[PDB]
């Protein structure tokens, strides 16, 4: 009954589409047509972290909003003191093909991974004075594109084998594997309550997952190309997705739809990174065209450009206190903007 | 300013000094991206992601195998942007065989397609290629048993291995579309020891001399 199953799938997709069309009575643009514009915010670079001798592929702030970890293809994992530009640590990696890194919320650990297919977790706080590998998580058949510490013992990792996994660090075994994507999963974002997380893959589909259950609650489409960056809205009820179709999109969870489209006719390059601000009024996206744009998340109006990098702005991050935004790039420099 | 702050600054200076030392150490060690089968034979000749390190005549090499990576190359080939050279391996015996992995298209068509994609990337514009046209011994018998027309219907039939291998080689460098900027160093892999490694060493030495001239502003 293959034809019957295909017909059921098609009619059920059409039911999805009709239910989404019914609840689209208005638009975020129409409702926000009355709110005053943000203006033209010009952030100035404050620090410039130097010491990487290759492309920077990932950065992650610390929950203290002062320490940040950087991953680069020179095989080093540098822990930075952003206020003083000092180097707290410099972890030498077994493999130099690191594509992602994360900072533990407590600050005790740091993770990284890449084309060696292994998420390596490093103990920053040891009695013998150095940083050592505490665990090598190896169950993925494709390169790790993202990883986020769910707590001090759980980590959720996405890989380019179309699967994300939830790991248990103390045993090194993956509690829950998240299947359903038809393409390589590129990014990953954890909800503030850490009960859900969104993953955007190379199939131009963003899925909303439940960590405890292990199922895809809700699948979001709309992008014309693969999604490289994903980020939750601060209240955990929406998320934005930067892709390769030169367009960022704000999807809603309670409505199951796209709210706004952040596109300009000049920008024809993909989005490497996406993050919100503390209030959610600003959306910062880094592009292949050497810089980072600030978007009005409610008006879809560009409100600034962070033009300070001589290569692709790969990683991007906003502090938990909202004070600064840090952009890394293939030019081997991290800059703190404010 | 404070005592602990000055001590931390000294720690950071030591860290940066070791970083600079490691960077200048790694600057003069040659990276080789191996694509492709013959890859196993080539990597055994000088003997996730496989990095095999060999030393030949006071020079340090690294060879990267990415065969196990069954993902989109567009998502991680920019990582390998910046390598010294690319080693491409082609089985000359795989011209009469079909079904590369499971399809109806024959081999030496998939090989040429992958060669065209790698050779013409936006990333490998200044990156030389070392072609290894392997499987000569099998080719000797295969060209006699069956004509070359099977793989190439538009071929002038002359099956003696003296110029059919030359025809395959000529097509492979004809796939290059940015000549006068990139060089295809082609070699027919002989099983003799200390022969392929010498070819790689000569090609890489030429590439190094080109790069130093470019840094000097001459070439």
């Amino acid at each position: 009954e293959l034809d019957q199953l295909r017909q059921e799938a098609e009619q059920l997709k059409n039911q999805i589409r009709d239910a989404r069309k019914a609840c689209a009575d208005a638009t975020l643009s129409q409702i926000t047509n009355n709110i005053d514009p943000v203006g033209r915010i010009q952030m100035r670079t404050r620090r410039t972290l130097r010491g990487h001798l290759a492309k920077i592929y990932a950065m992650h702030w610390g929950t203290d909003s002062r320490l940040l970890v950087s991953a680069s293809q020179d095989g080093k994992l540098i822990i930075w003191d952003s206020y003083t530009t000092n180097k707290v640590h410099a972890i030498p990696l077994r493999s130099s093909w690191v594509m992602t890194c994360a900072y533990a919320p407590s600050g005790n650990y740091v993770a990284c991974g890449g084309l060696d297919n292994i998420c390596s977790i490093y103990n920053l706080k040891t009695r013998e004075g150095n940083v050592r590998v505490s665990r090598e998580l190896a169950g993925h058949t494709g390169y790790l594109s993202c990883c986020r510490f769910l707590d001090d013992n759980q980590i959720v990792t996405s890989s380019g084998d179309t699967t994300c996994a939830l790991w248990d660090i103390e045993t090194g075994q993956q509690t829950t594997t998240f299947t359903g994507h038809t393409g390589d999963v590129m990014s990953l974002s954890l909800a503030p309550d850490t009960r859900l997380f969104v993953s955007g893959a190379c199939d131009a589909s963003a899925k909303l997952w439940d960590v405890r259950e292990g199922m895809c609650r809700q699948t979001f489409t709309g992008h014309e190309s693969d999604i490289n960056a994903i980020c939750f809205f601060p209240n955990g009820n929406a998320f934005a997705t930067g892709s390769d179709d030169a367009t960022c999109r704000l999807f809603d969870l309670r409505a199951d739809q796209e709210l706004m489209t952040y596109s300009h006719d000049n920008i024809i390059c993909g989005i490497t990174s996406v993050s919100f601000s503390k209030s959610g009024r600003l959306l910062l996206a880094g592009y292949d065209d050497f810089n980072c744009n600030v978007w009005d998340a409610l008006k879809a109006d560009r409100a600034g450009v962070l033009a300070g990098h001589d290569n692709r702005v790969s990683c991007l991050g906003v502090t938990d206190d909202g004070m600064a935004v840090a952009t890394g790039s293939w030019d081997s420099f991290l800059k703190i903007w404010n | 300013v404070s005592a602990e702050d000055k001590a931390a600054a000294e720690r950071s200076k030591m860290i940066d000094k070791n970083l600079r030392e490691d960077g200048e150490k790694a600057a003069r060690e040659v990276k080789l991206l191996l694509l492709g089968s013959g890859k196993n034979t080539i990597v055994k000749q000088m003997k996730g992601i496989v990095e095999t390190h060999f030393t030949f005549k006071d020079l340090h090499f690294k060879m990267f195998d990415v065969g196990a990576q069954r993902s989109e190359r567009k998502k991680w080939i920019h990582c390998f942007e910046g390598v010294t050279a690319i080693i491409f391996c082609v089985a000359l015996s795989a011209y009469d065989l079909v079904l590369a992995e499971d399809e109806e298209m024959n081999r030496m068509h998939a090989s040429m397609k992958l060669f065209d994609s790698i050779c013409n990337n936006k990333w490998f514009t200044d990156t030389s290629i070392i072609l290894f046209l392997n499987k000569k011994d099998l080719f000797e018998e295969k060209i006699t048993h069956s004509p070359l027309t099977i793989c190439f219907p538009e071929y002038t039939g002359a099956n003696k291995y003296d110029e059919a291998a030359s025809y395959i080689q000529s097509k492979f460098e004809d796939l290059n579309k940015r000549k006068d900027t990139k060089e295809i160093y082609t070699h027919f892999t002989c099983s003799t020891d200390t022969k392929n490694v010498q070819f790689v060493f000569d090609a890489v030495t030429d590439v190094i001399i080109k790069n130093n001239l470019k840094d000097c502003g001459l070439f």
Partner: single-chain antibody, 230 residues
């Protein structure tokens, strides 16, 4: 971790002796090292400091030209070559490791001690002996002469504990930063000059002598010592 040290003994006045401490477990090269004296019936005094990488070297005014400090990282040893020994140089010498970065815990492990016998911010602890019994709370006070609150929001006052027969143990490195394996009943508070340590649920193993020492300026200064007795 182990910082074992030897080289003490009886020496005539005006002679020369060398002390040596050998590190065992931790990464010796990444730690700065201190020499701290403890006179027979007196408190703790600071002698020298050798920076990680042997960059910066500091001495007390008493031992500036006479004593010298050097380290051998490949051998994992720290030396103290003492010259012109006088009767005030008799003490039990401790080797203290200190790593310095953001959030570090300086002065965390001490050595056993070597007995050598020869034939500035003012840190004050008015109390000299507090009569205590197990069960209730104890507050130990400590005042300074210069405000230890830096412009970077850090107060550089550490806390230490010598039990009747052991080397000092760090309790609170920053104003209120509890050490690694110290029970949560310890705490600290203050603004710039007035400091206090509050043990909440005292027991037998918490009795000893408590010192407060500043890390604001190079001549690190300890206190007289506040003693808790059962």
């Amino acid at each position: 971790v182990q910082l074992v040290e030897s080289g003490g003994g009886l020496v005539q006045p005006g002679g020369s002796r060398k002390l040596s401490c050998s590190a065992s477990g931790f990464a010796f090269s990444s730690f700065g090292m201190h020499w701290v004296r403890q006179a027979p019936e007196k408190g703790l005094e600071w002698v020298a400091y050798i920076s990680s990488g042997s960059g910066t070297i500091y001495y007390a005014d008493t031992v500036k030209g006479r004593f010298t400090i050097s380290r051998d990282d490949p051998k994992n040893t720290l030396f103290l070559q003492m010259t012109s020994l006088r009767s005030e140089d008799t003490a039990m010498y401790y080797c203290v490791r200190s790593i310095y970065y953001y959030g570090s815990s300086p002065f965390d492990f001490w050595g056993q001690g070597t007995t050598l016998t020869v034939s500035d911010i003012v840190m004050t602890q008015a109390t000299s002996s507090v009569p205590v019994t197990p069960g209730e709370s104890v507050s130990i006070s400590c005042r300074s002469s210069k405000s230890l609150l830096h412009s970077n929001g850090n107060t550089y006052l550490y806390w230490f504990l010598q039990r009747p027969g052991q080397s000092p143990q760090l309790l609170i490195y920053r104003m209120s930063n509890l050490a690694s394996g110290v029970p949560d009943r310890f705490s600290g508070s203050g603004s710039g000059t007035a400091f206090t340590l509050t043990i909440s649920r005292l027991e037998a193993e918490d009795v000893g002598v408590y010192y407060c020492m500043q890390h604001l300026e190079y001549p690190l200064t300890f206190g007289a010592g506040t003693k808790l007795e059962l």
